[PDB]
mmCIF file of C-alpha atoms and ligand atoms in Angstrom:
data_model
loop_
_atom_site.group_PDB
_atom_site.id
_atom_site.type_symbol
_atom_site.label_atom_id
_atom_site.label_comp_id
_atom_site.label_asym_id
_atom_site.label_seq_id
_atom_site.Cartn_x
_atom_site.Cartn_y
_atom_site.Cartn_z
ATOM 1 C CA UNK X 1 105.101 92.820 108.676
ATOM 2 C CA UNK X 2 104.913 93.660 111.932
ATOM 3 C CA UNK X 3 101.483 95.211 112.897
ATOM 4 C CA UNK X 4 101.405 95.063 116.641
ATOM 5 C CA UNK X 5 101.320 98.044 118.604
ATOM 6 C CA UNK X 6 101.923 98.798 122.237
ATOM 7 C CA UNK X 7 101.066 101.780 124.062
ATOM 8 C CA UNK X 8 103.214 104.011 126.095
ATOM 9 C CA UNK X 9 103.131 107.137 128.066
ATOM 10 C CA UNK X 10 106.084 109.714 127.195
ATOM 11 C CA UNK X 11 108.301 109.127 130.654
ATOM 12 C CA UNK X 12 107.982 105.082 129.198
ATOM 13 C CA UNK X 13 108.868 106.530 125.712
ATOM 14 C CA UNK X 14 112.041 108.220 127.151
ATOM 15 C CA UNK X 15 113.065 105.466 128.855
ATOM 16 C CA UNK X 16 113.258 103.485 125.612
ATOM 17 C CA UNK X 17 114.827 105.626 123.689
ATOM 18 C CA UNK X 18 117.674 105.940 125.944
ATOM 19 C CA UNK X 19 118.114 101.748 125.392
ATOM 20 C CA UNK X 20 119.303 102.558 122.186
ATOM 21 C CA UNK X 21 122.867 100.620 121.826
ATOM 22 C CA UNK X 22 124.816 102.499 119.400
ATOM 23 C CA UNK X 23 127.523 104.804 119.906
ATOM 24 C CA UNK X 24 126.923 108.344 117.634
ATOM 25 C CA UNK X 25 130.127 109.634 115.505
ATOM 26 C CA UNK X 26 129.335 112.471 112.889
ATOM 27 C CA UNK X 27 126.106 111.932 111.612
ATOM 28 C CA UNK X 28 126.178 107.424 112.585
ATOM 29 C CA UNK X 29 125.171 105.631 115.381
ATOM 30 C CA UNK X 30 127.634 102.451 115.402
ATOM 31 C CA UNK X 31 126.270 99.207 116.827
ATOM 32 C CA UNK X 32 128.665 96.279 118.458
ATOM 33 C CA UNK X 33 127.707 93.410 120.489
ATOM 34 C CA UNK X 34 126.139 89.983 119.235
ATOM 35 C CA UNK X 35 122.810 91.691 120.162
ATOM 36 C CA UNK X 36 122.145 95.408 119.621
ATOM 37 C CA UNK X 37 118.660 97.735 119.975
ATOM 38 C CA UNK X 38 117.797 100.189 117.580
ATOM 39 C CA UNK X 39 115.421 102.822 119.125
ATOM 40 C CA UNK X 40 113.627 104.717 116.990
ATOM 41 C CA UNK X 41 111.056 107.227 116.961
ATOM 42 C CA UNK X 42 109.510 109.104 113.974
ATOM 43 C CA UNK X 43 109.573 112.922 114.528
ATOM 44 C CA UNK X 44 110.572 113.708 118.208
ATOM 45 C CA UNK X 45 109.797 116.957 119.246
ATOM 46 C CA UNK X 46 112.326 119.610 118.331
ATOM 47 C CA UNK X 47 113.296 117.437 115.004
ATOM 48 C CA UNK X 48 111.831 118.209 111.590
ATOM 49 C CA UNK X 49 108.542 116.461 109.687
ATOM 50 C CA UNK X 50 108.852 114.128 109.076
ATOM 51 C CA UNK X 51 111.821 112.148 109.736
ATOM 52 C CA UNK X 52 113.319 108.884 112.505
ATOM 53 C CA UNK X 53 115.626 110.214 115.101
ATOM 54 C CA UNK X 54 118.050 107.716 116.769
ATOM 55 C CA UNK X 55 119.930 108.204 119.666
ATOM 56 C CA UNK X 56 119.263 111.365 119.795
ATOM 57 C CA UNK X 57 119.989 112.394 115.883
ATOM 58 C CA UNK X 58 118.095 113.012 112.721
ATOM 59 C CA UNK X 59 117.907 110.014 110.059
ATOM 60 C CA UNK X 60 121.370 108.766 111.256
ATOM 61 C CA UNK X 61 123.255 105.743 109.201
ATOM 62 C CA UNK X 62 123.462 103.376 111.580
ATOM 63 C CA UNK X 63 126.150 100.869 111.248
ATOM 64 C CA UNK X 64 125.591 97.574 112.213
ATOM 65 C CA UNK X 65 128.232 94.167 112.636
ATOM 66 C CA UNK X 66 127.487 91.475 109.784
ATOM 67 C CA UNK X 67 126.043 88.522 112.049
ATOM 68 C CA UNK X 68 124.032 90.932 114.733
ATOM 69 C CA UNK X 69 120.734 90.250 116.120
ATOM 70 C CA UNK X 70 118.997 93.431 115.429
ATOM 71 C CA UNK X 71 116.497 94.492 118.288
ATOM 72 C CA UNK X 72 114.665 97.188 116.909
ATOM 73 C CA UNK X 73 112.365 99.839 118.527
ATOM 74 C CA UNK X 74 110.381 102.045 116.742
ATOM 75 C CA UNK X 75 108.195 104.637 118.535
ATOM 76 C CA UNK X 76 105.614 106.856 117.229
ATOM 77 C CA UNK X 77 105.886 109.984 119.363
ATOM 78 C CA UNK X 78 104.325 112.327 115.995
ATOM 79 C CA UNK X 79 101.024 113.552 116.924
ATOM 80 C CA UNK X 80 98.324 113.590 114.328
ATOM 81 C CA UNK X 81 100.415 110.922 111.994
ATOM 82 C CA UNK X 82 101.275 107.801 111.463
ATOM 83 C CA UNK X 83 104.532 106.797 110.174
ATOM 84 C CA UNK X 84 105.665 103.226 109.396
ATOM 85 C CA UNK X 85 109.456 101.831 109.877
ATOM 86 C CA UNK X 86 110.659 99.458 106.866
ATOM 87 C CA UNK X 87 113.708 98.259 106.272
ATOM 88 C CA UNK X 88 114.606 97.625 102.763
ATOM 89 C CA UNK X 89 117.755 97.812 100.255
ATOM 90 C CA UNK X 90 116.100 100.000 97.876
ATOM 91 C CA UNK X 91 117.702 103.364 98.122
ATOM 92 C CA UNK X 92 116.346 106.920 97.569
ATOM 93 C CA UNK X 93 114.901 108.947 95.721
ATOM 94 C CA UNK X 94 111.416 107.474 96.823
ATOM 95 C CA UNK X 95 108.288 107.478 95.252
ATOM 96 C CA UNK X 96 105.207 109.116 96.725
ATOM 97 C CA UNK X 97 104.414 105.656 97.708
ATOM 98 C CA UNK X 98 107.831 104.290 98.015
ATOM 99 C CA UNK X 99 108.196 100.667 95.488
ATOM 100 C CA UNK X 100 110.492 98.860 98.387
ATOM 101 C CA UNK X 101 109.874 95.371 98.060
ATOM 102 C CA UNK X 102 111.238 93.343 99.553
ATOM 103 C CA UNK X 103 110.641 95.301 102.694
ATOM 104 C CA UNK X 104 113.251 92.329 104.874
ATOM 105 C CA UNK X 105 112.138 93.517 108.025
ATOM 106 C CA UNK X 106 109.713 96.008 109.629
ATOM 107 C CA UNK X 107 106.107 97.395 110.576
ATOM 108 C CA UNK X 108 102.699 98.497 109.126
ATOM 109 C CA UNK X 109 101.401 101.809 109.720
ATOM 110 C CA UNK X 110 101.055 102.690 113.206
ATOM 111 C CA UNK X 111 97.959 104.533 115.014
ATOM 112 C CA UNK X 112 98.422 107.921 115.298
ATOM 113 C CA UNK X 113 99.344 109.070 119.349
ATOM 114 C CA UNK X 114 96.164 109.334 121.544
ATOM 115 C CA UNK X 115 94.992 109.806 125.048
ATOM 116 C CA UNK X 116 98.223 111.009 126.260
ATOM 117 C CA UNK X 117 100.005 107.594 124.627
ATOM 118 C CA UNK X 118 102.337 106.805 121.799
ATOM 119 C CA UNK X 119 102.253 103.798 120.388
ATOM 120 C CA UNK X 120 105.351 101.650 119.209
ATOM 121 C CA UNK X 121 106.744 98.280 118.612
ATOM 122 C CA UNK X 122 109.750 95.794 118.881
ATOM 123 C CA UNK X 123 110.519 93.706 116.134
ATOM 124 C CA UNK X 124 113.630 90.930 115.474
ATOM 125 C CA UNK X 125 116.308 91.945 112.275
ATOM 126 C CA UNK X 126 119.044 89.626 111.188
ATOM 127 C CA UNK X 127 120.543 91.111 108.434
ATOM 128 C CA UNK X 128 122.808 90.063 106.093
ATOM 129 C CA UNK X 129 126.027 92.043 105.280
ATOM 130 C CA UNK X 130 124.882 95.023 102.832
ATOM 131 C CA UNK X 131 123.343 98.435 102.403
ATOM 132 C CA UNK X 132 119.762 99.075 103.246
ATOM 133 C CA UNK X 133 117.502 101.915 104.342
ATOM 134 C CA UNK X 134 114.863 102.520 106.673
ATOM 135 C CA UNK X 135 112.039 104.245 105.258
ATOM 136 C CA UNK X 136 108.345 105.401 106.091
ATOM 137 C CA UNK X 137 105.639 104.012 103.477
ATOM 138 C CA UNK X 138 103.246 106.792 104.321
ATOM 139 C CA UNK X 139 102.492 108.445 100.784
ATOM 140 C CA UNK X 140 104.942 111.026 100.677
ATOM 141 C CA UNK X 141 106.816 110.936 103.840
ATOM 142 C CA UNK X 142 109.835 109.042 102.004
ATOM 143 C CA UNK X 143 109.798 111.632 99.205
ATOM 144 C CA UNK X 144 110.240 114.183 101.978
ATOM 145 C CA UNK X 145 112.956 112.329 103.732
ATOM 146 C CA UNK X 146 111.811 110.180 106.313
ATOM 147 C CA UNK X 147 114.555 107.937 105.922
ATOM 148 C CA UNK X 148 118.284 106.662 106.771
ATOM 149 C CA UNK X 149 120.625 104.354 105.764
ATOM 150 C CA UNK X 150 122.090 101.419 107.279
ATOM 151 C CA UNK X 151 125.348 99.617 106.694
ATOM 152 C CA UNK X 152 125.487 95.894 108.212
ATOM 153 C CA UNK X 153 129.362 94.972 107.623
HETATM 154 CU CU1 CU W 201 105.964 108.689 108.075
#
């Protein structure tokens, strides 16, 4: 898993989360390109605990083209917690400590924000056509919704 964090003040947290590729419809950020970036962030302010916003929306499906590069972002802008990002085809309801093995592509637990810094990371997906979710393993934040679905067809 990925478990290399990088720090960033909020103006450098904005500026990544408006690099995120997709194009929102309904409640779905949709992806094209050979190479597409995911931002995410768990819990931006103004959005409910705990759960990812993407491009701007609450645990959004996001739909991705079978044969994509996957750039993905994930941010930690939730002071006080950490949150993980995992991505992983087993599906809701989740445990207390979500049973999501395989986890195909994603991070450890992340520090919690400090010093006036968030910290995130960048990792490298290349799915294969099918349904899968990205969930938080922190006990109990799955069970309480931190998660979404993605569709790579
Ligand atoms: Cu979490």
């Amino acid at each position: 898993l990925d478990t290399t964090w990088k720090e960033a003040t909020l103006p450098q947290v904005k500026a990544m989360l408006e690099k995120d590729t997709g194009k929102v419809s309904g409640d779905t950020v949709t992806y094209s390109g050979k190479t597409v970036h995911v931002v995410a962030a768990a819990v931006l302010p103004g959005f409910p605990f705990p759960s990812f916003e993407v491009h701007d929306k609450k645990n959004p499906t996001l739909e991705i083209p079978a044969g994509a590069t996957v750039d993905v972002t994930f941010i930690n802008t939730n002071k006080g917690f950490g949150h993980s990002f995992d991505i992983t085809k087993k599906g809701p309801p989740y445990a207390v400590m979500p049973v999501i093995d395989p986890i195909v592509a994603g991070t450890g637990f992340s520090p919690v924000p400090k010093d006036g810094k968030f910290g995130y990371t960048n990792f490298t997906w290349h799915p294969t056509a099918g349904t899968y979710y990205y969930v938080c393993q922190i006990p109990g934040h799955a069970a309480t919704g931190q998660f979404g679905k993605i569709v790579v067809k």
